[PDB]
Amino acid sequence: NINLIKILYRKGLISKLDYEKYKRYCIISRFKNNILY
Amino acid sequence: MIAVKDITDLNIQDLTSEVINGDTTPSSAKFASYIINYNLSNINLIKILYRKGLISKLDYEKYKRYCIISRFKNNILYFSTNYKDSQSLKIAIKILELPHDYIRKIDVLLTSIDSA
Numbered sequence: 001n002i003n004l005i006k007i008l009y010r011k012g013l014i015s016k017l018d019y020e021k022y023k024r025y026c027i028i029s030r031f032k033n034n035i036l037y
Numbered sequence: 038m039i040a041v042k043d044i045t046d047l048n049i050q051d052l053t054s055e056v057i058n059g060d061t062t063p064s065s066a067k068f069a070s071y072i073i074n075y076n077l078s079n080i081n082l083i084k085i086l087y088r089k090g091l092i093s094k095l096d097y098e099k100y101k102r103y104c105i106i107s108r109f110k111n112n113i114l115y116f117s118t119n120y121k122d123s124q125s126l127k128i129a130i131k132i133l134e135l136p137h138d139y140i141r142k143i144d145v146l147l148t149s150i151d152s153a
Contacts, residue, residue, distance in 0.1 A: 006102060006105035007102070007105065007116065007119045007120070007122075007123060008116065008119075010119070010122075011115055011116070011119055
């Protein structure tokens with residue numbers, strides 16, 4: 001959001017959107033909460 | 038008066054009829070500028086008529102990005118993959134002279150792909 005507020009800026013966003021799901025996969029690996037939604 | 042039209046939209050981030058003078062202020066402009074079409078689109082943000090100004094922003098920004106694509110004399114590898122990311126993003130999604138100007142980037146990217 002520092003760059004947000006030419007096409008090279010969104011090249012950093014794809015690095016963010018990649019490992020965030022991998023970090024969300026760590027939050028998915030940490031899904032020992034057993035909910036329905 | 039014109040750059041001072043963004044002086045009143047600075048007060049919009051500072052109430053319903055007070056934003057009504059800011060309602061047509063984002064509509065008088067789009068009926069008649071690069072940074073102004075980015076900030077004032079966020080002036081209305083922070084019914085369906087507001088997003089009618091957003092489509093005017095999302096249209097010419099790619100045309101301005103086509104000027105940034107016409108200015109792609111930087112010969113990289115991820116940038117050329119980003120060049121397909123700017124062209125095939127609207128190929129399903131989205132004015133006569135810009136379409137003929139779109140072929141200019143189509144030849145010069147492959148000309149630079151032949152160069153580098």
